[PDB]
Every structure is written in C-alpha cells, then in structure tokens.
Amino acid sequence: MITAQAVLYTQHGEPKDVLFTQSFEIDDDNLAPNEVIVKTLGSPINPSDINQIQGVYPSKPAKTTGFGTAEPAAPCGNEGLFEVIKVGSNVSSLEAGDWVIPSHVNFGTWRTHALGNDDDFIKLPNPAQSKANGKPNGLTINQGATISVNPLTAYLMLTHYVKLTPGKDWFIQNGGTSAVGKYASQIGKLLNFNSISVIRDRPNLDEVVASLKELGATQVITEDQNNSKEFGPTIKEWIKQSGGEAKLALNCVGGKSSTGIARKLNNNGLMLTYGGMSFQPVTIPTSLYIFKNFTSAGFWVTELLKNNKELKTSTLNQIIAWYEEGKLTDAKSIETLYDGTKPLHELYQDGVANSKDGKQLITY
C-alpha cells in the first residue's frame, strides 16, 4: 500500500484560501491489467492551474469523492513529470523507471502519486535512456515537467499557421520575458526567423535585452517603444533592410500592447492571442482590418491538440530532440522539495504567492 497526498479543493476560490491536503491510499498490490502507478518527480504552477482553481477556466477536473473526501473535491495542476513505479500484467508501453507526462489535461499533477491506465501517459526518455541512445544530453526534471504546454505552444504558433521565409521574415511578440516568449525566441533562432520581442521596462532592462538577444530575438523593445509614434519608423527600417516582412504577431498581453504589435505587421498579417494580462481586451485599429488585410485569431494548445495525437507527437518529439541535442534551454525554475514535514498544499500555496519571483516547480 501507498499513502499518497493530493492538493484538492471542494470549492472554487483563490489558492491561498481553498486548497487543502488529502491523504489517500493507492493499493499497489491490486493493479488491473492496463493500470499503472506513478510517483511524481515534479510539477509546475502555471497560470492556467490557478485559473482552474479560481473557477474562471472552462476546462477542469470533475469534483469527486474519489480521494476519500466527505464532500466532492477536485485535484489541481495539469502539467507534470512522473516516474512509473509499477505496471499491470497487460502493460507493454511502459516499464518501471520510465519517465512520463500526462497524455491529457485535467489529470491533477499537484500530488505525490497517481493510479491510471497506461494510455493516460506519454513516455519521455529518462536521462539513462537518452544516454544509451547516443545523445549528448538527457532531460532535466524541470525540462520534463514543463515540456507539455509552453514549448509546444511556442513551436506551433510559429510553424502551424503562417509560413515565415527563413532568413528574412519576422514575427513580433509581446510578453517577451515569458516562458513561451523565451521558447519562441530560441525557435526563431533555430528556424532562422527574425523577431522583435516587446517587453515591459524594468530596472535591469539592458541586461534582459541582451539575454533575449542571446536566445534568438533579433531586436527587443519596451512597451513604451511599442506605443511610440516617434520610434515606429525605426522598426520599419529594420524590416525593409531584411528584405522580408512582419507576418505574425503573438499576443499574450492584450490592450495597448496588442494594438502596438498589430500596427507593426505588414499587409496580410496574422495575430495569435494565447494569453491576456489584467483582463485587457485585444484592441486592434479598424484600419488594419479593412485596409491591411489583418486577421486576429486565438491559440489554445489544449484545444488544438485535443483530437490530434499526430501533431502532438511530432511537436513533442522535436522539443525532446532539441533538449537532448542541447539546442533548446528552459528558464530556471525555483524548486521547492516536498519531504513530508510541511503539508503539500502549503508548498503550492507558497508557489502561487511567489509567482513573481519566477516559475515555481514543486519537486519530490
């Protein structure tokens, strides 16, 4: 028997208020043929995880009594890296020691262990397997734990919608210091796309500009510069010198920021909105729609990959390969380790409260 812990809530609300820890038992001596038990290695706290708990995110796990609660309760977290510890008699796709991520959203990754079917998981190579296969690197725990959402989001936005001519075309994105933003800059470099990252001003602005440039941003500007009529002709000069066009805007901010990046595209431009700060709506001047053949659409990786295992597979495989090859890098998570001395839900509550410090990964 296994005494596991899960972070649950019986009612929607702010993580600081509604989360608790529930002890639950998994009978590892009673696996059905296709069942698998996994041990969590690490799971991050993403904004979507928080929005789920708050009740403002339209995709979420059902509240049930399955963790042994009196009242119906839901688990938390959508992304995570797990280690297979035992498999049922009919399981061939996974073996003990293997690394896996959930195959679907709403699995509940803020917990120590899970019991599921073999098809509830997707195998990733563990470091020993990458090394045995001749690869110069294996995945870190943070890389495996965050591979499912942000890297895939960047890659698909860049490649699945409009075709940028290598060596000349441009994308422009806001939220340039975001995890997605940082992956997009790297993928831009890898595919030879030019790009402009728009970021908020900050005390170490110049140092951040230089880091984003090292990742693959061609140019980095502030939101002030994005807003600026004075500065606008400088950006046109960059694009004209390249021989290419700005064809794609990636928006995770909304409001004025969205207006600014849209205005920087050439005719026939496409914006993809994948996020939104401060509840500020996407705001686009009428003239761009009418006179510049501008299109504005959405991106949600959960929905795009819902019924498209093949695209998911192909994309995930490219990200894995790039990690193994040392061609892609993750932003450094702040890791908090669960040892059983502080309730698990409190580790996640701290992580939510400390979101501003960096991406928070709870490890095990």
Ligand X SMILES: NC(=O)c1ccc[n+]([C@@H]2O[C@H](COP(=O)([O-])OP(=O)(O)OC[C@H]3O[C@@H](n4cnc5c(N)ncnc54)[C@H](OP(=O)(O)O)[C@@H]3O)[C@@H](O)[C@H]2O)c1
Binding residues for NADP(+): 150, 177-180, 200-202, 274-277, 299-301, 359
User: How many CB atoms are closer than 10 A to CB 100?
Assistant: 24
For 13, which DSSP code?
Answer: S
Q: CB nearest ligand X: which residue?
A: 275
| Minimum CB distance to its own copies, residue 349 (Å) | 26
Q: Does residue 289 belong to the site contacting its own copies (CB under 8 A)?
A: yes
In the complex with its own copies, which residue's Cβ is closer, 93 or 295? Answer: 295
For ligand X, give the closer residue by CB, 88 or 276.
276
334-337 and 20-26 beta bridge pairing:
unpaired
Q: Which stretch binds ligand X (CB under 6 A): 30-38, 158-166, 178-186, 261-269?
A: 178-186
Residues binding ligand X: what is the number (CB under 6 A)? 25
Q: Which residues are annotated as a binding site?
A: 150, 177-180, 200-202, 274-277, 299-301, 359
Decide: is 175 part of the binding site for ligand X (CB under 6 A). yes
Which one among 5, 130, 150, 186 touches ligand X, defined by CB under 6 A?
A: 150
Q: Is 297 in the site for its own copies (CB under 8 A)?
A: yes
Q: Which amino acid is at 115?
A: L
Per the rule left: phi > 0, alpha: psi between -120 and 50, beta: everything else, 358 is left
| 3-class SS of residue 236 | helix
Query: Which CB, 116 or 176, lies closer to ligand X?
Result: 176
Parallel, antiparallel or unpaired: strands 121-124 and 113-117: unpaired
The pair of structure tokens assigned to 119 is 């098809």
Is 259 a binder of its own copies (CB under 8 A)? yes
Q: Binding to ligand X (CB under 6 A): which residues in 34-53?
A: 46-48
Region from 70-78, 80-88, 165-173, 273-281 binding its own copies, contact rule CB under 8 A: 273-281
Calpha distance 139→323 (Å, rounded):
6
Residue 275 binds ligand X, judged by CB under 6 A: yes
Q: Using the rule CB under 8 A, which residue among 1, 134, 279, 310 binds its own copies?
A: 279
Active site residue 57: yes
Q: Name the CA dihedral angle for 150, 153, 158, 160, rounded to a multiple of 10 degrees.
A: 160
Q: How far apart are CA 32 and CA 210, in angstroms?
A: 54
Are 113 and 102 in contact by the 8 Å Cβ rule? The answer is no
Which residue, 20 or 300, has its beta carbon nearer to its own copies? 300
Span near its own copies by CB under 8 A; candidates 138-146, 180-188, 239-247, 289-297? 289-297
- Tell which one of 277, 282, 311, 352 touches ligand X (CB under 6 A): 277
Q: Which does 200 bind (CB under 5 to 8 A by kind): its own copies, ligand X, none?
A: ligand X
Q: According to CB under 8 A, which one of 139, 284, 328, 344 is a site residue for its own copies? A: 284
Among 230, 290, 297, 339, binds ligand X (CB under 6 A): 290
**Residue 3: DSSP 8-state:** E
Would you say 1 or 297 has its CB closer to ligand X? 297
Length of the chain: 364
Question: CB–CB of 60/100 below 8 Å?
Answer: no
Given the residues 57, 155, 183, 338, select the one marked as catalytic.
Answer: 57
What is the rounded CA–CA span in Å between residue 249 and residue 272? Answer: 6
Q: Are strands 2-9 and 74-75 parallel, antiparallel or unpaired?
A: antiparallel
Q: Which CB sits closer to its own copies, 91 or 288?
A: 288
Q: Are strands 74-75 and 35-45 parallel, antiparallel or unpaired?
A: unpaired
21-59 core/surface letters (b: 16 or more CB in 10 A; e: else):
bbebebeeeebeebbbbbebbbbbbbebbbebbeeebee
Q: CA 44, CA 223: separation in Å to the nearest integer?
A: 28
Candidates 89, 204, 241, 286; binder of its own copies (CB under 8 A) is 286
Active centre residues (catalytic)? 57
What is the binding site for its own copies (CB under 8 A)?
A: 58, 254, 259, 273-276, 279-300, 303
